[PDB]
Amino acid sequence: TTDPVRMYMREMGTVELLTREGEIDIAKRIEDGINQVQCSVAEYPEAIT
Amino acid sequence: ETLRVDPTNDRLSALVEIYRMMRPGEPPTREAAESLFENLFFSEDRYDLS
């Protein structure tokens, strides 16, 4: 098939929908890592100042 | 001799292969293959109504 629409829809067709806590879990892992980079800010050299 | 070369003798394979000719590379789903097969050229929608 030459079409990128078949290719793309078959490729998005690979991964499924993860719902109702994996969304909030993505959000929680995201915010956790974020919180830890601002920890890394909290333990600063001149870089932050 | 055809059966000795090829063993498919079922309708649902007929319908999946219907899908597959109609929607090649696309995943056959049964109401899709069947609604395809039917609604295309026996629904009132298509035969516009003229």
UniProtKB/Swiss-Prot annotation, chain A:
UniProt superkingdom: Bacteria
Residues that span the membrane, as ranges: none
Subcellular location: Cytoplasm
Function: Sigma factors are initiation factors that promote the attachment of RNA polymerase to specific initiation sites and are then released. This sigma factor is the primary sigma factor during exponential growth. Preferentially transcribes genes associated with fast growth, such as ribosomal operons, other protein-synthesis related genes, rRNA- and tRNA-encoding genes and prfB.
SUBUNIT field: Interacts transiently with the RNA polymerase catalytic core formed by RpoA, RpoB, RpoC and RpoZ (2 alpha, 1 beta, 1 beta' and 1 omega subunit) to form the RNA polymerase holoenzyme that can initiate transcription. Identified in a complex containing RpoD, the RNA polymerase subunits RpoA, RpoB and RpoZ, CRP and DNA. Interacts with Rsd; this prevents interaction with the RNA polymerase catalytic core and with promoter DNA, and as a consequence, promotes transcription from promoters that require alternative sigma factors. (Microbial infection) Interacts with Escherichia phage lambda antitermination protein Q.
Family: Belongs to the sigma-70 factor family. RpoD/SigA subfamily.
Domains as described in the record: Contains 4 domains, connected by flexible linkers. In the active conformation, the domains are in an extended conformation, each making extensive interactions with the RNA polymerase catalytic core.
Name used for this protein in its record: RNA polymerase sigma factor RpoD
Organism of derivation: Escherichia coli (strain K12)
Residues shown, of full length: 94 to 142 of 613
UniProtKB/Swiss-Prot annotation, chain B:
Highest taxon of the lineage: Bacteria
Disulphide-bridged cysteine pairs: none
Signal peptide start and end residues: none
Role according to the record: DNA-dependent RNA polymerase catalyzes the transcription of DNA into RNA using the four ribonucleoside triphosphates as substrates.
Quaternary context: The RNAP catalytic core consists of 2 alpha, 1 beta, 1 beta' and 1 omega subunit. When a sigma factor is associated with the core the holoenzyme is formed, which can initiate transcription.
Entry's family note: Belongs to the RNA polymerase beta chain family.
Protein name: DNA-directed RNA polymerase subunit beta
Organism: Escherichia coli O45:K1 (strain S88 / ExPEC)
Higher taxonomy: Bacteria, Pseudomonadati, Pseudomonadota, Gammaproteobacteria, Enterobacterales
Span of the entire protein shown here: 349 to 398 of 1342
